[PDB]
From a paper:
PrPC is a cell surface, predominantly α-helical, glycosylphosphatidylinositol (GPI)-anchored glycoprotein that is sensitive to protease treatment and soluble in detergents. The structured C-terminal domain (residues 125–225) comprises three α-helices (α1–α3) and a short, two-stranded, anti-parallel β-sheet. A novel variant of prion protein, V127, unique to the affected population in the epicentre of the kuru epidemic, was also identified. In this variant, the glycine at residue 127, which is fully conserved amongst vertebrate PrP primary structures, is substituted by valine.
The V127 protective polymorphism in human PrP was always present on an M129 allele, consequently our main interest was with the V127/M129 PrP variant. To determine whether the overall structure of PrPC was affected by the protective V127 variant we crystallised recombinant human PrP (residues 119–231), with valine at residue 127, (V127/M129 and V127/V129), complexed with the Fab fragment of the anti-PrP antibody ICSM18, as performed previously with G127/M129 PrP. Consequently, the Cα of G126 in V127/M129 PrP is displaced by 2.9 Å, and the Cα of L125 by 2.2 Å (equivalent Cα atoms of most other surrounding residues are displaced by 0.2–0.3 Å). Furthermore, the V127 polymorphism appears to reduce conformational variability at residue 127, and concomitantly increases structural definition of the β-sheet, as implied by a comparison of relative B-factors of this region in V127/M129 PrP when compared with WT G127/M129 PrP. In V127/M129 PrP, the average Cα B-factors for both the N-terminus (residues 126–131; 30 Å2), and β-strand 1 (residues 128–131; 27 Å2) are lower than the average B-factor for the core secondary structure elements (31 Å2). The introduction of the bulkier valine sidechain at residue 127 appears to sufficiently perturb the side-chain position of R164 such that the interactions with E168 are essentially removed (the equivalent distances are 3.2 and 3.8 Å). The Cα B-factors for residues 169–172 within this loop are higher than the average for the rest of the protein in both V127 structures (50 vs. 38 Å2 for V127/M129 & 56 vs. 45 Å2 for V127/V129). We found that although V127/M129 PrP can be induced to fibrilise within the time scale of the experiment, it did so with a significantly longer lag-time than WT G127/M129 PrP.
Numbering used by the authors:
A (entry chain A): 125 to 225
B (entry chain H): 1 to 129, 137 to 215
C (entry chain L): 1 to 210
The structure:
């Protein structure tokens, strides 16, 4: 776990899914999803998509272990939705690292 | 093939509380949403809150916080709405509504009447003179009563009129047209059920 | 609290007519949903996600709209479609409904079939005396009922109740119940129920002797 960087908090974005049922679900469940991401350092990556892919998997993983000690459970609708919001977040974290810092 | 069954009508005293149920049957969805909606005097619809019954999550309309409490028994697929500290404005029909993407089901509603009045059963009187017969269902509290004819075998030409209220007591009527020649020759019964008192009354129409 | 406003509030249409009703939002929603509710029944989802028909909803229905203006159209009005339609949004908490459009169907005028019934012997046995008049399968809704007990009107002691428009034949129906004490009932003889209505240009009389 000492190989990972941890980013500071961010506002979770609103994601749109193509149906009202999913849009309402997301917005009603989104507080259960992460608002910070885990990543590997930038100097290991050639391109943005590879960083985003790892950041996504690392972050989902830690979040699913942290919160099943809590006593949360995730449906598969929740893991798909985390996949989408965490991707966006990993993208923002990449832009923080490379432009803003 | 999924269906929602809600619990029966309640007469509650002002100040008390009640709890109504909504049980989802033959369901096979993992994560669906269950809304609760109130309807006041046959018209205006208001959303109260929701529960996702398969892990935890619960939403309220601000207006009903302190008034409704939503929970779920996910061992028996039954969802509950507690209503605290009732008054006359809480008299209404309450609905649970299931949603899963394209699919939607609504319960048949639960009538809550908030009143300090006392359950009273109706008296059923037959109306004897195609020809027309009826039943007069008079002096009951609270709503609802359901009226059948020959247990539902008689559906064509039935009119059942909405109840109206006279001095804390409801009165309704139902009328039925049947062929000139099936009556009196064939047996005409009107069956009335008052679920609050748990009376069921079968009055035969015989010619007067 | 996105407010939803529906117009018109009441609408009448002829069989075959194109009918449109509108739902307007005080702010932008992404999608709108519409419910149908007939008399006695619970609401049922009719169109969801703005333009998708729920199961068992006839093809002649359609929905559209964007931002703050949404409409429900019926390309050809049928008697079955007489009902109340509500819009509803899930854009933000609290989720709100519109106040409904009540849709009725025009039909060729029909006269009521009138039946009067004396009190049953059960009723007289225990207390009182309710004389009931049924007035059935008429159009249009506007009717009017007077009782006569031996040639004298009575307004006090009379419960009226109307049905909503029938889905099959689009008629309306009323019951008027005159209720009296046994004593006052056995003090008189002739009992007339009497209705005024567009169809006839003279009262519809039904009576009995005691």
């Amino acid at each position: 776990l000492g190989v990972y960087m941890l980013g500071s908090a961010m506002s979770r974005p609103i994601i749109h899914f193509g149906s009202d049922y999913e849009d309402r679900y997301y917005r009603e469940n989104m507080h259960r999803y992460p608002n910070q991401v885990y990543y590997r350092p930038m100097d290991e990556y050639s391109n943005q998509n590879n960083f985003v892919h790892d950041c996504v998997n690392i972050t989902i993983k830690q979040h699913t272990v942290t919160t099943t000690t809590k006593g949360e459970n995730f449906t598969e609708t929740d893991v798909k939705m985390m996949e989408r919001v965490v991707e966006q977040m990993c993208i923002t974290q990449y832009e923080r690292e490379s432009q803003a810092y | 093939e999924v269906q929602l069954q809600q619990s029966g009508p309640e007469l509650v005293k002002p100040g008390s509380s009640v709890k109504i149920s909504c049980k989802a049957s033959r369901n096979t969805f993992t994560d669906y949403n269950l809304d609760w909606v109130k309807q006041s005097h046959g018209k205006t619809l208001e959303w109260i809150g929701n529960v996702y019954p398969n892990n935890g999550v619960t939403g309220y309309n601000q207006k009903f916080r302190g008034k409704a409490t939503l929970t779920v028994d996910k061992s028996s697929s039954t969802a509950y709405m507690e209503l605290h500290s009732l008054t006359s404005e809480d008299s209404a029909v309450y609905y649970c509504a299931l949603y899963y993407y394209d699919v939607s089901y609504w319960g048949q509603g639960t009538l809550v009447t908030v009143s300090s009045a006392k359950t009273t059963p109706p008296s059923v009187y037959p109306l004897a003179p195609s020809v027309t017969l009826g039943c007069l269902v008079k002096g009951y509290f609270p709503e609802p009563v359901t009226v059948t004819w020959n247990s539902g075998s008689l559906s064509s030409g039935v009119h059942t009129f909405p109840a109206v209220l006279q001095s804390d007591l409801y009165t309704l009527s139902s009328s039925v047209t049947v062929p000139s020649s099936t009556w009196p020759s064939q047996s005409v019964t009107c069956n009335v059920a008052h679920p609050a008192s748990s009376t069921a009354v079968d009055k035969k129409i015989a010619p007067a | 609290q996105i407010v939803l406003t529906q117009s018109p509030a009441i609408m009448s249409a002829s069989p075959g007519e194109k009918v449109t009703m509108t739902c307007s939002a005080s702010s932008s929603v992404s999608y709108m949903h519409w419910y149908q509710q007939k008399s006695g029944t619970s609401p049922k989802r009719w169109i969801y996600d703005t333009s998708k028909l729920a199961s068992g909803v006839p093809a002649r229905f359609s929905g559209s709209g964007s931002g703050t203006s949404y409409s429900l159209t019926i390309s050809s009005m049928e008697a079955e479609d007489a009902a109340t339609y509500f819009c509803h949004q899930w854009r933000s908490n609290p989720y709100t409904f519109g106040g409904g459009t009540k849709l009725e169907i025009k039909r060729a005028d029909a006269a009521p079939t009138v039946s009067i019934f004396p009190p049953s012997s059960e009723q007289l046995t225990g207390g009182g005396a309710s004389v009931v008049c049924f007035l059935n399968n008429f159009y249009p809704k506007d009717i009017n009922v007077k009782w006569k007990i031996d040639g004298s009107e009575r307004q006090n002691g009379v419960l009226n109740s109307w049905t909503d428009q029938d889905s099959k034949d689009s008629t309306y129906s009323m019951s008027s119940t005159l209720t009296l004490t046994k004593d006052e009932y056995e003090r008189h003889n002739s009992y007339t129920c009497e209705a005024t209505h567009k169809t006839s240009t003279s009262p519809i009389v039904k009576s009995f002797n005691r």
